[PDB]
């Protein structure tokens, strides 16, 4: 693992220092249907004309990015995503910009959000949850080794591919940082207490978020929920967690160590780092190399009808993609 990460860093740093730019243009694609929206972007299924391949095109309105104070975040998002390379990270295939918008064209992950399956099924079995959790553990090990913090782990940002494995999308809050950072960002249910309390924080927040994810996958609801974010934050900071009756003793132990307010006690953040998690009893059956090599049989594989099938995604209201004859925010996004 230590040789692997060393080589992986060399590869990442070359691309980090000299990023890819302007590798496609809008008229090379036919836009088909919206796959998802979020606070910032719209992601559309598109067909690349010259190849016939389908992709997922994230479209960011430059003026909205500026309004929502996401300039640096969006530049981070693209710079990091074009530089990373890992089996459970979605691949950025092209990126480009026009007068009005920024575009990031990713591999289309057709199995849908984990979110939709989780809500429909209700909850995942512990082996099912563990399979996904192991992929996230390996991905964070990779990202943290590159000095990256991810900061938006949630089922809505996790896609299921044709083999039933996870693809992490949405690097909107990802940041390369060696020290502390202070930005209040993420999604309410998944925020670590130290973010809420306006403290400097570090990559330990991703391990907290993993605790929340595992809990939600196995329970079918988050460990801290309420009608409004303010009410959720009060629950998070108190830190009191109650577990479903069906949770194994091993799972409860793991979660007590991940959903730990005390940073000196939180798994992932101690002397042994990620190995405290990898060697925990809950993961005793996990073959970590087999997961990385994608040789483990997935517990669930979504139904796939054919190329361009969007059956695993909700329907969204469509909007015209507008491109002004005047360049917007040219200097701000020069490096994009």
């Amino acid at each position: 693992v230590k040789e692997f990460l060393a080589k992986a860093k060399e590869d990442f740093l070359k691309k980090w220092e000299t990023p890819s730019q302007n590798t496609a243009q809008l008229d090379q694609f036919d836009r088909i249907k919206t796959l998802g929206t979020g606070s910032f972007g719209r992601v559309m299924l598109v067909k690349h004309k010259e190849s016939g391949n389908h992709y997922a095109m994230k479209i960011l309105d430059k003026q909205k990015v500026v309004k929502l104070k996401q300039i640096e975040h969006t530049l981070n998002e693209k710079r990091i995503l074009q530089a990373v390379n890992f089996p459970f990270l979605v691949k950025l295939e092209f990126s480009f910009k026009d007068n009005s918008n920024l575009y990031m064209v990713m591999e289309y992950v057709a199995g849908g959000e984990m979110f939709s399956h989780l809500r429909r099924i209700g909850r995942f079995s512990e082996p099912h949850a563990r399979f996904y959790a192991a992929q996230i553990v390996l991905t964070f090990e990779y990202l943290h080794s590159l000095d990256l913090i991810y900061r938006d782990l949630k089922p809505e940002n996790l896609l299921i591919d044709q083999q039933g494995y996870i693809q992490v999308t949405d690097f909107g809050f990802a940041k390369r940082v060696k020290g502390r950072t202070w930005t209040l960002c993420g999604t309410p249910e998944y925020l670590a207490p130290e973010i809420i309390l306006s403290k400097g924080y570090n990559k330990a927040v991703d391990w907290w978020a993993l605790g929340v994810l595992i809990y939600e996958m196995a329970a079918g609801y988050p460990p801290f929920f309420a009608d409004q974010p303010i009410q959720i934050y009060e629950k998070i900071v108190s830190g009191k967690v109650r577990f479903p009756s069906h949770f194994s003793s091993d799972l409860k132990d793991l979660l007590r160590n991940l959903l730990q307010v005390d940073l000196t006690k939180r798994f992932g953040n101690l002397k042994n780092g990620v190995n405290d998690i990898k060697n925990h009893k809950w993961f005793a059956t996990t073959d970590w190399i087999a997961i990385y090599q994608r040789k483990v049989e997935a517990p669930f594989i979504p139904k796939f009808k054919g190329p361009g099938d969007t059956s695993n995604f909700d329907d969204y209201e469509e909007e015209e993609i507008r491109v002004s004859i005047n360049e917007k925010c040219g200097k701000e996004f020069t490096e994009f």
């Binding site: 998802g36 929206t37 979020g38 606070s39 910032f40 929502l68 996401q70 959000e113 979110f115 809500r119 938006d152 949630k154 809505e156 909107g172 809050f173 209040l184 960002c185 993420g186 999604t187 309410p188 249910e189 329970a219 079918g220 609801y221 988050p222 929920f225 309420a226 009608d227 409004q228 974010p229 109650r242 479903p244 909700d314």
Partner: peptide
């Protein structure tokens, strides 16, 4: 039950990032 309370709550749909 906690499940019933969650399903009757206002945050069972997709959650977007804070902004």
């Amino acid at each position: 039950t906690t499940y019933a309370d969650f399903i009757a709550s206002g945050r069972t749909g997709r959650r977007n990032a804070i902004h």
